[PDB]
Amino acid sequence: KETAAAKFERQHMDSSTSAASSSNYCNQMMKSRNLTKDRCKPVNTFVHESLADVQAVCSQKNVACKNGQTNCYQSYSTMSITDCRETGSSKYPNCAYKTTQANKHIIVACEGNPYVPVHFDASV
Ligand SMILES: [Cl-]
Ligand SMILES: [Cl-]
Ligand SMILES: [Cl-]
Ligand SMILES: [Cl-]
Ligand SMILES: [Cs+]
């Protein structure tokens, strides 16, 4: 039901903050974005740039996706991101995440018309 583009936005965009606040940032965002609803999503990255800047990566450097697809694009500059990863002691429904703030290039897979990000492949 949710489109691939809308799901990308819900799971990865956080333009309201320039960077991960506290160490509690991942526990509040994984929950508020309904990512701990049926289970604990194990890993997830949030991008703290405007939607328009993330969408423009689809016109940047074309690289291979980890899965071998060729519709991946690496951003030219680094972006503010937050990595959210379940801790060894996380157990649904008590999901617990480690927040790691970093500044790096993002690699996204793009598709459709308009050609927008539909999958977060990795950061470098
Ligand atoms: Cl959409
Ligand atoms: Cl939702
Ligand atoms: Cl991710
Ligand atoms: Cl994804
Ligand atoms: Cs930037």
UniProtKB/Swiss-Prot annotation:
Glycans are attached at K1, K7, N34, K37, K41. It comes from the Eukaryota. Keywords: Disulfide bond, Endonuclease, Glycation, Glycoprotein, Hydrolase, Lyase, Nuclease, Secreted, Signal. GO terms for biological process: defense response to Gram-positive bacterium. It catalyses: an [RNA] containing cytidine + H2O = an [RNA]-3'-cytidine-3'-phosphate + a 5'-hydroxy-ribonucleotide-3'-[RNA]; an [RNA] containing uridine + H2O = an [RNA]-3'-uridine-3'-phosphate + a 5'-hydroxy-ribonucleotide-3'-[RNA]. It is found in: Secreted. Pancreas. Substrate binds at K7, R10, K41, P42, V43, N44, T45, K66, R85. Its main location: secreted. Its EC number is 4.6.1.18. The keyword Kinase does not apply. Interacts with and forms tight 1:1 complexes with RNH1. Dimerization of two such complexes may occur. Interaction with RNH1 inhibits this protein. Monomer. Belongs to the pancreatic ribonuclease family. Endonuclease that catalyzes the cleavage of RNA on the 3' side of pyrimidine nucleotides. Acts on single-stranded and double-stranded RNA. This is Ribonuclease pancreatic. The chain holds residues 27 to 150 of 150 of the full protein.
